[PDB]
Design a protein around this ligand. Structure first.
Ligand SMILES: CC(C)N(C)S(=O)(=O)N1CCO[C@H](C)C1
Length: 171
């Protein structure tokens, strides 16, 4: 059976219990912590691409009000995020299972850009999600996995200084 697991969950849970924030910039900012995924149960000889997107967890704008995050009154439909292709893609099952798949080079932006960068809406809450994509033929398959532990609000600067401190402590 194809098994997907989060590497360093105990660390992500420190961020999650404070409400996690990720910086977005015009040119794009890399994530900390980095999403790292443990994958077993692939065909070592089959061909796969690893894809990363961000699901809007709710339809609301969030704001830091008197030391705490609160959702706004007026929900809007959240268009799905664009997909980031892991740069090792496409690759053999063996490549993906030999070490954690690390999305260290994805950059989160707030502006529509040349490409590479993934544009998110600031003050929206996101749930990272991967798609493992077995390419070509009649054996083609997608398996998707969400990482609730890795939820964050996109921000142009940190609001909760406890997050600022954890980011620095562990970087
Ligand atoms: C676009 C193309 C290169 N593919 C990844 S596919 O094999 O035709 N394909 C797309 C949907 O997911 C499955 C893996 C089947």
């Amino acid at each position: 059976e194809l098994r997907v697991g989060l590497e360093e969950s105990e660390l992500w849970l420190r961020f999650k219990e404070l409400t996690n924030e990720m910086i977005v910039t015009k040119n794009g900012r890399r994530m900390f912590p980095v999403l790292k995924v443990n994958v077993s149960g692939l065909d070592p000889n089959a061909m796969y691409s690893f894809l990363l997107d961000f699901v809007a967890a709710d339809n609301h704008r969030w704001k830091y009000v008197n030391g705490e995050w609160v959702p706004g009154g007026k929900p809007e439909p959240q268009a799905p995020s664009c997909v980031y292709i892991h740069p090792d893609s496409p690759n053999f099952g063996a490549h993906w299972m030999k070490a954690p798949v690390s999305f260290s080079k994805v950059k989160l932006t707030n502006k529509l850009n040349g490409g590479g960068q993934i544009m998110l809406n600031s003050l929206h809450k996101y749930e990272p999600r991967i798609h493992i994509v077995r390419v070509g033929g009649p054996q083609r398959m997608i398996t998707s996995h969400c990482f609730p532990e890795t939820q964050f609000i996109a921000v142009t600067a940190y609001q909760n200084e406890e997050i600022t401190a954890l980011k620095i402590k562990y970087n």
